Amino acid sequence: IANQPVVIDNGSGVIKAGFAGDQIPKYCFPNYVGRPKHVRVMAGALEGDIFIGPKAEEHRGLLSIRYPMEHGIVKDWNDMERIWQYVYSKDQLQTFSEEHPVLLTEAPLNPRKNRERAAEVFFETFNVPALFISMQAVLSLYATGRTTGVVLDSGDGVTHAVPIYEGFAMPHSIMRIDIAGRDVSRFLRLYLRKEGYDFHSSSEFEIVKAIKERACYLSINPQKDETLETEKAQYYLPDGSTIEIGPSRFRAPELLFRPDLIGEESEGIHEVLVFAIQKSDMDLRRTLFSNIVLSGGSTLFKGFGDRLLSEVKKLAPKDVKIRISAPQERLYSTWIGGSILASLDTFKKMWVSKKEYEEDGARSIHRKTF
Amino acid sequence: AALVVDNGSGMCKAGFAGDDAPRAVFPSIVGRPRHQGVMVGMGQKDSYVGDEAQSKRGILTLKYPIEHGIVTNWDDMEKIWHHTFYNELRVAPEEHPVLLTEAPLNPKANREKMTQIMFETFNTPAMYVAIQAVLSLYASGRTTGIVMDSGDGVTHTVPIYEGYALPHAILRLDLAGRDLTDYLMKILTERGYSFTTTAEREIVRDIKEKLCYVALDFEQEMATAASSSSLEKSYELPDGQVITIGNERFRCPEALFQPSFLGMESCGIHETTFNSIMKCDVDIRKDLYANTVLSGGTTMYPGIADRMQKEITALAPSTMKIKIIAPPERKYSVWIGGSILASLSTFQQMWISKQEYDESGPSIVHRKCF
Amino acid sequence: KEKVERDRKKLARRRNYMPLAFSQHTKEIKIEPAQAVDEVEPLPEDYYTRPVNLTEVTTLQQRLLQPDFQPICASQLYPRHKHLLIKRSLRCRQCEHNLSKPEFNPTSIKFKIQLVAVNY
Amino acid sequence: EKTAVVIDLGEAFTKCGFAGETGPRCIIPSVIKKAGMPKPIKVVQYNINTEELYSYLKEFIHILYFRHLLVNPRDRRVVVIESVLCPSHFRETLTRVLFKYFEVPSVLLAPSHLMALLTLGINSAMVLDCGYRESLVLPIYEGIPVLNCWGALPLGGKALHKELETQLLEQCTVDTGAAKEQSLPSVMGSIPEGVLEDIKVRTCFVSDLTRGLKIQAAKFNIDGNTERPSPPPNVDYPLDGEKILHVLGSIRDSVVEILFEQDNEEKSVATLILDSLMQCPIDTRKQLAENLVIIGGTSMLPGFLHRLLAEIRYLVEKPKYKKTLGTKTFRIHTPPAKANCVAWLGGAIFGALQDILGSRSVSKEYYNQTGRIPDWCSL
Ligand SMILES: Nc1ncnc2c1ncn2[C@@H]1O[C@H](COP(=O)(O)OP(=O)(O)OP(=O)(O)O)[C@@H](O)[C@H]1O
Ligand SMILES: Nc1ncnc2c1ncn2[C@@H]1O[C@H](COP(=O)(O)OP(=O)(O)O)[C@@H](O)[C@H]1O
């Protein structure tokens, strides 16, 4: 069917939907299911037992937040079906899923059962004309408009580094670590309890993510800022109460660059970028250092590019040019890539038709992926 | 009275010369704890080694000191040798002379620094480095024939005819047990079961040793794996959780025979064994086909010998008879050779003494290596 | 063992010989760890359908005065020995002595060295 | 050397005594009776000005070191037991009080969970700490606390005291002694915390899982007609002499259920162990599960250990925890001292080790020089 394809980013934190024609995603809402915290027997309470996106944000304190997708993998599929149904609601897009074809953006090196079940839902529950699963990293390059480039895509659920040179992705050089934005939000909650402010509730976890997003700066030297006495910058909560964050502000997102501090066995965001380049062939190393692209929401931390440049330089070889080319629209970079890809006439060949999936089998989605 | 100490990348096999099997066999690893700023409890060792670190895997970050038969961290290797002599063997290094094993075509600094420690740190009376492949022949009571000694660190092919080695015919391949273990993690992550940490990698090695087997026809085995669930076997983890690895069982050891899977762009363990025989003199080829030995624990995969014979026979001429030598004790084939060598009265002269080391230096080892 | 390890490590750092092997390097007490019960004793069925006399059960204050085995029932609660009191003596930061009390403070209101702001 | 003192400053009660003893010498409510104030102010209070906190702790430590313990503070060392993730400024103040005012030789800031493990003798064990403010859990594996896999919920003493006060005010039946033989509701606007605590301990108990699960659905009234078990008899409690409060049988066995209630989120005192254990490393699972430790005075409540261990094994079968923690054998450790005084006993056992104490502990000479107490946060 010729009618405009619907791009949808499967972001663990925020799913971004919209049409391929639009330069930006019109409808982007948080990826969580909202049910009433108190188990509702009586009338005059929150009805439906389902609150998604803007409806949830309004009555947030009353509801109990449950993320359906963890570490770029779908844990509860029933929840994810309701989320994708809300994408084709009167609230967002307001269209038939049966008419328009779909593009998914699954993280690299995900389970094959995750891709197979994702297709089954979108072909059976929704009567889609055609579906195409793609890598988040490959899209990010289409948006910026360069063929060569390493893509350090720091999402909410997973942070992954994929090196692609002249439209060729080395699949062995891909590096994936689970320590992402959501873990930084979890570790900030621990440090906020060490400052003396508890956020025990699942609703109260959402305002820790807001505190992180508002006020958390990455110091170039962490040891100097610790010895220096903090200003203790006040943050205002939804109720109106003030909280002085203090040293927790800067030593929370540090755990990205040094995850051994809390006690998580991972490489680190500076390390995975360098290791991904060093794993690739010697001839390409210089060009891959010379073309690095930051993607996702967990790069927007104040002074992230400043710290990463410094942490990469000392690990990388001496007298090598390191350009970390961040776009202005890092959060919405992954979708814009899909929107451009979808618009091209080549995409018509790439996607798998509904009749193709019935005849060919299950492999059809996997083999056409690349 | 003399000590044989195999310095394998996977496992360190140590024991007394003359004995049938090695006394102490432990995994060659150093376990440093994921410590926070919180104070630690009692009975705390700063760095654990071997069977102790194998018991306390959960918290300790497992760091293999020897990578591809090259000692990367010498301070770590020193702590293993200290655990080998004093604790495991219960013997003074000053009393007994120590035989060590190095893989062929290793860096010259490795053999140099190895002996320097044995002479200075441990104060050994005599020290001789030997090629692992040269020892492995003595195990089978065969002077003539090639060996395919595939270890955890490296795999090497050393052709030796009538007690005379062909140095230029020796070929080294970096593909080994640890690369297969790393490969098995990736394909298990594709199935669903994610293993990231250093402790988890050790559990994946236990899965590999028990279940994984070499297929005769890979394409035929993949067809049976797709249709029937007969090859699918269950394994219980340290946790009560059980996993069904399926087709990935026989997919892991395939990487040996076709490195393209791992993405090394090199010849297979079958093809390198053929290439090594062809590099040798035309006359002696006959005996090398007739006496092809498989050594190390990477040749203890069920049915590697059958697959090896098939692949060599196809490459080799039709008239030639290809017999693969697979003794029951392949894991301890390097050590048992060392025990036979050290015991022989002829070898008494070949030892490098302290007096010889003191006058000449550590460079003397390169002359009296092989 | 940790003291000897820490001492041996510290004198090796102080020496700064880079762990030079001059001489040869390198009875045990083993406690059995407490056995874990499969099922802990349930609440007795008496507690259900029985009048609770507040005289029989003990309050928190009198429970906590006997901390070694704080008993719920009154019949278990034994009388503890009477707590000894203290005779304070003050000493300043800059100054040394200030005031103090006799060795027979029992049944005495005399100060060995009388010093107070109202008395100067 | 002298036998080092052990102090354990809590919101409800403080444990005090000397090292190498069977239990604590003094255990008292953590408050101070200041002139003018009718109700005594609480000594530990998080999120206040440092100067006001300094004065309260100075006043409290003085009472511990002279009226309760009889020993010179400057002479002998200190072993300060405080829970992990204790507020930064509070711990900084507590040390600054001991080092500046009292001039103690050296303080050792031991985490309560690691101390509780020493008392049993086992090197690795899961430790739940059901205290006054928050019920915290922290897996300890072979001496190393795993901060990565922490867990806390506000289902302790404070949350239980508040729940009791609410229920009593609804079904309020007091005999004032002024033609108040008839049921009189809410004669007093609020009930003092001292009374509520005494009612909780004596009257209220923890129900069986089978009876408790019915009580949860009963008070909910989820399309059912009077589906509650038969309650215990109503107990009459004196308030301030003349006023006799008749405590309803339902309140006794319903007040506790707020701890073990799911409340949609699936966040109980029971769930917190399994939520933490699932997040732990795959190798550590079977060792931690087999070695459970239940400290804190909230777990002293009669029939708590049976309900918890039962509620665990029920929540195991639930589909979320059924995959990972399905075929696991959960066994509880019985510590030598009582559930309240497990934390203290560890510090005393540790305090008896004079050789290790001096090395690990922070000396006054170091603090006066630097002015930087070591913590699990960055240095
Ligand atoms: N029965 C088995 N089946 C399959 N793989 C095995 C088996 N036993 C061991 N392995 C794998 O092969 C490796 C064999 O290591 P081994 O014990 O031979 O020591 P090594 O370090 O390789 O020494 P060397 O290089 O001297 O042979 C192990 O690390 C493991 O990954
Ligand atoms: N301005 C910001 N500053 C700091 N962190 C941010 C900011 N915006 C988003 N984040 C973090 O990044 C997350 C968004 O990740 P996102 O880019 O949507 O991932 P994905 O690429 O998988 O869609 C948020 O949940 C938050 O943790």
Ligand SMILES: Nc1ncnc2c1ncn2[C@@H]1O[C@H](COP(=O)(O)OP(=O)(O)O)[C@@H](O)[C@H]1O
């Ligand atoms: N022996 C006991 N029996 C029953 N309940 C008790 C007992 N001792 C204390 N409690 C209750 O449990 C709580 C335990 O708190 P505690 O652990 O002493 O404080 P903290 O957590 O601040 O160290 C008290 O507030 C009290 O309500």
Ligand SMILES: [Zn+2]
């Ligand atoms: Zn003076």
